[PDB]
Structure 1
Amino acid sequence: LEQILWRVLRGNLFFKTVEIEQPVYDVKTREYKHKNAFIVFSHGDLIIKR
């Protein structure tokens, strides 16, 4: 996801990855996997929508 973000949004966009202590079950995957936070900040409404 980070590589895709830095490619499509070639400009500068900060990231705030934070690790989750325990896995959370997924609906389609039917399994609990370790997750991380996807906090991201950028300017421009169109950029936010993208």
Structure 2
Amino acid sequence: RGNVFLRQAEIENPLEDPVTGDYVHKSVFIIFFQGDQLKNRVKKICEGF
């Protein structure tokens, strides 16, 4: 139930990527929950993918 505020920005003029070296433009889509187990599961899927 994504129901928290979105903090979004667009980053252009990138740099070489940490894990592929790709000089690829980025964009952050930030939604945070204060649930602790929810934070853990989100961390799991976010780090894994």
TM-score of the two chains, using structure 2 as the length reference: 0.55
| Counterpart among 36, 39, 47 of residue 48 in structure 1 | 39
After TM superposition, which residue ranges in structure 1, 4 or more long, deviate above 2 angstroms?
10-15
Q: Which has the higher strand share?
A: 2
2:31 is paired with a residue of what secondary structure? strand
Q: How does 1:6-25 map to 2 (within 5 A)?
A: 10-25=1-16
Give % identity. 46
Separation in structure 2 between the aligned mates of residue 28 and residue 11 of structure 1, nearest angstrom:
29
How far does residue 33 in structure 1 lie from its aligned partner after superposition?
Answer: 0.5
Give the unaligned 5+ runs of structure 2: 42-49
TM-score (structure 1 length as normaliser) = 0.54
| Consecutive unaligned residues in structure 1, runs of 5 or more | 1-9
How far is the alpha carbon of 1:11 from its aligned partner?
Answer: 4.4
